């Protein structure tokens, strides 16, 4: 993405998408493992489908004609040039379109992760805008691990976050 999350991270080497928590116990660059393996499987399937769908038989594309068979030579040249034109145009257009599709795929993965985190933190946290969420309670390492894992219990911190919300 390059929209509401305008900066990539160099300190996260584990996966393509992940988290970053600031806490009283310490900071860190965690990774979202399920999303990055799903993306890796998808990209592997995409590359293998692009490459392995090309099955070619044994052929020799070179022919030799004498000086009284130039119509045949020009017909063979037309065949070769037409095949080259078709393959070149198709390959370039395919690469362009699939690059666009892959970048949109990564953007969708990042946005889906963002909405997945946002759904759990209904109003126990507030969006900052860069891509970040500031809690109204004290999210320790157990709470952060629950948020990244997907089993964040809203009712446990609901009132503690509500009083902080209404304080300001």
């Amino acid at each position, epitope marked *: 993405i390059a929209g509401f999350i305008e900066g990539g991270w160099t300190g996260m*080497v*584990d996966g393509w998408y992940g988290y970053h928590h600031q806490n009283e116990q310490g900071s860190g660059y965690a990774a979202d*493992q399920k999303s990055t393996q799903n993306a890796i*499987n998808g990209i592997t399937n995409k590359v293998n489908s692009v490459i392995e769908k090309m099955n070619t038989q044994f052929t020799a594309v070179g022919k030799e004609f004498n000086k009284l068979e130039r119509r045949m030579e020009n017909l063979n040249k037309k065949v070769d040039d037409g095949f080259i034109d078709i393959w070149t145009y198709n390959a370039e257009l395919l690469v362009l379109l699939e690059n666009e599709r892959t970048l949109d795929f990564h953007d969708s993965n990042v946005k889906n992760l963002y909405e997945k985190v946002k759904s759990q933190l209904k109003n126990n946290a507030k969006e900052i805008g860069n891509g970040c969420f500031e809690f109204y309670h004290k999210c320790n390492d157990e709470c952060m691990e629950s948020v*990244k*894992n997907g089993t964040y219990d809203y009712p446990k911190y609901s009132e503690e976050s509500k009083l902080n919300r209404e304080k300001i």
Partner: antibody
Amino acid sequence: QVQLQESGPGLVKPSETLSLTCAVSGNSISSEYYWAWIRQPPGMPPEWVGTIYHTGNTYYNPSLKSRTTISMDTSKNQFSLRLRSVTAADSAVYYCARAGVTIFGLTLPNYFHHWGQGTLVTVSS
Amino acid sequence: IQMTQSPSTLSASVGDRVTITCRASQSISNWMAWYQQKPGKAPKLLIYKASTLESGVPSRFSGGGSGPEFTLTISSLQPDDSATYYCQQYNSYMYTFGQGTKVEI
């Protein structure tokens, strides 16, 4: 092209710290991959102890997290394990391994691809 | 996370097509790893990502499955296959090994 060699005391008295050191050749341990300690008690399955990243990030086994510490030497290729408060249950074979596989320019810590040799630590007196 | 590997012990003659099954408590990964440890030596990874073959590994070893269940298959057994086979999975920041499966001729 990666060679790992462990070294440490084969006999450790109880209730005393336990220091091992793995030295790496053919690779730079402050640059690319992750480096882990794996122990195996006699007649049991292997157990992951901890891992240190090339960025200096350490992740420990939750059961052994309190009394373990993995350190790196950014001068020569060495990483060391300091397992404290050692009981008779710590008598096991210890291994140093390289975790990390590179696909699509991304290095994942999923599996240990190269292993050391294994030093047997016996806790007795 | 709990990992169960079956059968615990196994004997089979040369040429038998053998299969070991590993089951994981949580299916957040489609990937599993297989190690072959011979007595007195360190484990040696054979399969990773639940299907990929490690370099230098004989082709008869293969892996399959997904979700909660994965399988390791040896087609043409060899006399040097007597070892303990382990299934391992890295989930979040934890590596879990499954109990071994001894193989005897």
